[PDB]
């Protein structure tokens, strides 16, 4: 715990006693396993005294020890970070980003990273204190690998969050810096840079265009094939978010030859990679007919159909979307091709899952196939739906009829209408 002389020395008037005391407090908070954060902040005036030492530009070591002490306090719970912010440390920490001492700079970054990473409230506050310009300056002027890592990680904390997301105008200027950082070889650097890009590309297509405008797509696609999962996984997330954009934006990713990478990642030994590869492809097959065709030419669908019937369920869900989206936007020849790969059977098998959302997705893909079958039956006067028989063979009709016992009204109403429209006696 604390001592009385610690308190009395901390408020002395000589730098010798101050620096020694702050170092004692720093050592206490820099100790495992359970740091005495409360005891330090509960002790009156202490937090304010640490903050006051950040202004001591004449004493480099005092600033360093002070920043470190506050850093470990801001690493705790939300209330513990509240005390540091309300002590007024944030605007001072931002000034210390342009400290002439590198050891003071880096610890300022770390502190601000911890503060911003507390909540969306703290994040927006840090951004409102204009951290971005000094931080990006520090990042581009850095000469140490440990400094850049901390800066990027802090930057990624400024981007993280969706409830609410940060004001895009206050975070988007970091995109050119982030773009250049993708060319580094450091795994830790690439990882946080790709996470920051995935945060920024997570939303409306305006935000996605800004990400694209910085020219990160080509590099992001190459990083899909990185041997470190700490890099490939966020890189896939960023690419996956970008192809949630419109047809034009999605095409950028495709012209970077992403599909052969995505095909390869469908066979990944890591479970989360296959799922997000499927998720990414599902957002591409939700595109136009040229893009669906691009997925066909990349020989992706035979694998998706294998996944649809045999993979881990949370991976099957995304493959279902991929097949279903393809049946809604595709040409008759494209849908005819999916049917020839045997997509009806594993679609029908999903009609009985307990995830009511995937049931609707399955129902949609089947209805799409059925509607095209009906249109096909009119463009040749046969009046016969060629896919009704295949669905019957796959016990789809029985399963659709069984859905009339499903509690979900949307599913019930849907199954009811399909039977009435395509399977009337």
């Amino acid at each position: 715990v604390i001592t009385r002389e610690m308190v009395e020395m901390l408020f002395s008037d000589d730098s010798d006693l101050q620096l020694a005391t702050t170092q004692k407090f720093r050592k206490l908070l820099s100790k495992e396993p359970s740091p005495p954060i409360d005891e330090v902040i509960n002790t009156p005036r202490v937090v304010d005294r640490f903050v006051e030492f950040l202004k001591r530009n004449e004493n480099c070591t005092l600033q360093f020890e002070a920043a470190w002490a506050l850093t470990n306090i801001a690493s705790g719970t939300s209330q513990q970070t509240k005390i540091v912010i309300e002590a007024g440390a944030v605007p001072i920490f931002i000034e210390l980003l342009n400290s002439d001492f590198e050891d003071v700079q880096e610890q300022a970054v770390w502190a601000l990273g911890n503060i911003a990473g507390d909540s969306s409230v703290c994040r927006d506050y840090v951004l409102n204190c204009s951290i971005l310009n000094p931080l990006l300056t520090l990042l581009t002027k850095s000469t140490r690998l440990t400094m850049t890592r901390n800066a990027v990680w802090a930057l990624s904390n400024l981007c993280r969050g969706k409830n609410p997301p940060p004001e895009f105008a206050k975070v988007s200027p970091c995109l050119p810096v982030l773009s250049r950082l993708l060319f580094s070889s450091d795994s830790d650097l690439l990882a946080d840079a790709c996470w920051a890009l995935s945060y920024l590309s997570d939303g409306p297509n305006e935000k996605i265009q800004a990400v694209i405008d910085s020219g990160v797509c080509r590099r992001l696609v190459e990083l899909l094939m990185h041997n470190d999962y700490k890099v490939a996984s966020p890189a896939l997330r960023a690419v996956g978010n970008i192809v949630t954009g419109d047809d034009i934006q999605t095409q950028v990713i495709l012209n970077c030859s992403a599909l052969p990478c995505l095909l390869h990642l469908l066979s990944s030994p890591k479970e989360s990679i296959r799922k997000e590869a499927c998720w990414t492809i599902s957002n591409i097959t939700a595109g136009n007919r040229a893009q669906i065709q691009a997925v066909i030419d990349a020989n992706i669908f035979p694998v998706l159909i294998e996944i649809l019937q045999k993979a881990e369920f949370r991976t099957r869900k995304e493959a279902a979307w991929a097949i279903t989206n393809a049946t809604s936007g595709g040409t008759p020849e494209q849908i005819r091709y999916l049917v020839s790969l045997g997509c009806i059977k594993p679609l029908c098998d999903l009609l009985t899952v307990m995830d009511s959302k995937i049931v609707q997705v399955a129902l949609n893909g089947l209805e799409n196939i059925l509607r095209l079958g009906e249109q096909e039956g009119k463009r040749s006067g046969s009046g016969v739906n060629p896919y009704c028989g295949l669905i019957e063979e796959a016990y789809g009709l029985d399963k659709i009829e069984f859905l009339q016992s499903h509690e979900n009204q949307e599913i019930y109403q849907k199954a009811f209408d399909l039977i009435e429209h395509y399977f009337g006696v």
Partner: protein, 75 residues
């Protein structure tokens, strides 16, 4: 429905009939403004209203990068 309505609705999944839990219906020209992952009713054809969502899905239903938002400096 019209060619325009059909083309637009290709980017959407029709979840079912009008559900007023999600409020008054959007028009077809407003529908593109719908946030990814959200649901809305939309006016189509001759006064019909259906509930929809974008087929373009955000990364919401996925895993986390929770490690690490905060880092303490030790040793």
């Amino acid at each position: 429905t019209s060619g325009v309505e059909s083309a637009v609705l290709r980017g959407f999944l029709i979840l079912g009939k009008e559900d007023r839990r999600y409020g008054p219906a959007l028009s077809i020209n407003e529908l593109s403004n719908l946030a990814k992952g959200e649901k809305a009713n939309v006016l189509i054809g001759q006064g019909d209203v259906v509930l929809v969502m974008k087929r373009k899905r955000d990364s919401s239903i996925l895993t986390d990068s929770q490690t690490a938002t905060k880092r303490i400096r030790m040793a």
